[model samples]
Target: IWESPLLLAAKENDVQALSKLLKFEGCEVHQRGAMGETALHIAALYDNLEAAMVLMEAAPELVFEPMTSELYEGQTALHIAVINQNVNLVRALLARGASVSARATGSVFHYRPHNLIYYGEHPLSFAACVGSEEIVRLLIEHGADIRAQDSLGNTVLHILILQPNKTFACQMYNLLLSYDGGDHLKSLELVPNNQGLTPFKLAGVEGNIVMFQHLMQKRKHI
Candidate 1:
């Protein structure tokens, strides 16, 4: 029976139980569950905002406690919160000093017809991969490394442009480029992934004329 009381309260979103549990003096608030997740990690993972807040208040350090399970290795609660797309939770965690650039050991698989490429991602990369321009900007404002690369050498711009939604893809491309008074535009466009595919080449592969032309137009100024 993989029963952890704090994990149970968080998993069920039982803020009342969680509050009582936290009040127990000398309680190991940072203990991991069977899956190696702390209460805060579960709260963020499941979008239990109230529970997450309770856990955060009980022990602010939990916000930075990296999960050690097989699936989400070395990912802080911020990383899970980003994957959940819980913008408020993400904001809360970040405000509490959760590492914006913390990288996870787990590899996210990108499956193609013949190959499955694995990429280790940071919280910002997760935001970009999910096409959350709002979260992307929020992370950038918090000092996320715009040029942070995954294990396979894919940058946020490299990941965003490959997503299926061309409209948001174009919008994110513009957003990423416009950062630091157009400095990102100068810096990131030519950066390539491990396979040596630059954002321009990926844009070409997707037949996104907007992105291709945008890169082409930017190239003249670089």
Candidate 2:
């Protein structure tokens, strides 16, 4: 089925219909559709906050289920919410116990624009690359690990460096940097990707002279 009745109600943002459908005898709130996306996934995609709230109430475990589609790369509603830049929705998902650091296992991220959007490969990376500093800050406050690399081995810092939005890139850098302290700064700045390219060197390769200079100021090379 392309979409089930519950998912349809979710996509429509009809909390009334969603409530009714969710109450049906033996209603499968866990039922997945063509792409194996649960109704909550549809709720996030449509930004149906009322419907998502109701769906999560119906099945709290749904908060953690990643979409099972191949191209979607196993992202949870948290990732979808980040992609939409819905900070409140993201707050709801995280508050409801969605994993702060779920990673999309898609191999392609280790290498496109849509792919780039989802494939920074995690929620914080999505927020960082999408230039949603508010959402990124919320994620950080929620305890998202800024130093964790994605499947591509690029930290949020590296992902920021690779992005074309130098303005937001630098802005996000300042935001994340405030959270870095002690040896944490070295870890975040000096960590390498799978290819052994740290953000410092990657910035140089991208010819991000300004970013390179910024990283250089904090550098303590061994």
Candidate 3:
């Protein structure tokens, strides 16, 4: 059984080993195991920024390789970076031409340590749910659609307002609106998830007075 040294190095964040292995004869940087995770995928999952840089620099094409992991199907290193909230890695992958609007194929379902079950997320949606302003902003700046829907048809704004952290949710909500001078505002308002709930409607249901008031003010100008 010939295990992939490159993948091992990436998981361990062994920049020295990764750099050396990448230079090894016949080293396939894009090689993925049965799990369908390439070296780039491992690096992103493990938050190995240096290892990721080295791997991407060696083979820029790997940045576009999607994760084959059943739990995170069709997600690239950029997707994983956003979920992990690695600002530096996110910027690095974006600069390397990672697709900002790439969506995951299969829905992701995971149970947190506290037994909280969460289902379905894309990169932008995941960032919005986690209340990561930096990641959300970076993705949007790179042309990620704040109005993009997830497997459940939930928009980024929908996910943002669902966050339990009301304060941070407000921040992300406001940030999305402020981005590009609200270029996506009208489009966002028109979209409803599987439940037929718009972002504004969700805000009202959640009793988020700040969000509701903010939406009202924005609508006034529309």
Candidate 4:
């Protein structure tokens, strides 16, 4: 009953009518439509900030409502804001205490053969792997776990070497070095994919000439 008109109004971005409808008949402001999408979700996905603000102001709980997907990709309003790449929207959500780490608990075969295939990977390990320093720093600032791992238990470095770009590979090496690789001897203990193989081993396997030479030299001292 309430779902039809409310959902439509949100989809249409009819903020005035939506506000009236919400208060007109004392409707439940946080109604869920198909696929568990709240009106705010529909509005946010459409970039209807006005309608989204209205719905969120009336029902702040909707802000925390999880967006529907069959599994790991399912997100909340905050995740939607991030993917939309609206800096204002992202900041707004964060100011309102939107959780940066909110994740869909449902599992759905998120593994990639390389590494970093989980939903958590997107805001964390994957971000680091792809070397999106902005997103990675933002996520880390908001308490995203830096130590997160992929299905194979690889850190961001494992995902980085999967591709052959030298700049990114260097960035990943420097990034890891900063976080944990700074100590020469300690770095040897790091297993790239938790497969009893070190980063040095993987570099050798991939024939990364520079890294192999550097790592081999470093290994001699140990």
lDDT of each: 0.78, 0.81, 0.76, 0.62
Local lDDT at 119 for model 4: 34
Tell me the spans in candidate 2 whose CA falls farther than 4 Å from its real position.
1-3, 107-119, 217-222
User: What lDDT does candidate 1 reach at residue 125?
Assistant: 76
Give me the overall lDDT of model 1.
0.78
Collision count of model 4: 0
Superposition error at 154 for model 3 (Å): 1.8
lDDT of 2 by residue, 1-222 (tens): 334788888898988988887788566889888777899999999888889999998889999998777756577899889988898899988888788889876544544544544337778888888888789888988899888877678888888887777887888887886787666246577789988998889999989987898888866442
- Scanning candidate 4 in windows of ten residues, the lowest lDDT window is 114-123
Model 1 TM-score on a 0 to 1 scale: 0.84
Residue-pair clashes, model 1? 0
Local distance difference test, candidate 2: 0.81
Arranged by lDDT, best first? 2, 1, 3, 4
Across 126-197, the per-residue lDDT of candidate 4 in tens digits comes to 445445566655666677654556556655555455455656666655654555535545352365565755
Estimate, for each residue in 56-137, the C-alpha lDDT of model 1 and write its tens digit: 9889988878877766677888878777788999899888888987878753334244424333378887776667777888
Per-residue accuracy of model 3 over 151-179 as CA lDDT, tens digit each: 66877777666566777777777777676
Residue 116 in model 4: shift from native, Å? 14
Overall local distance difference test of candidate 3: 0.76
**Candidate 1: regions farther than 4 A off:** 25-27, 108-120, 180-186, 205-210, 220-222
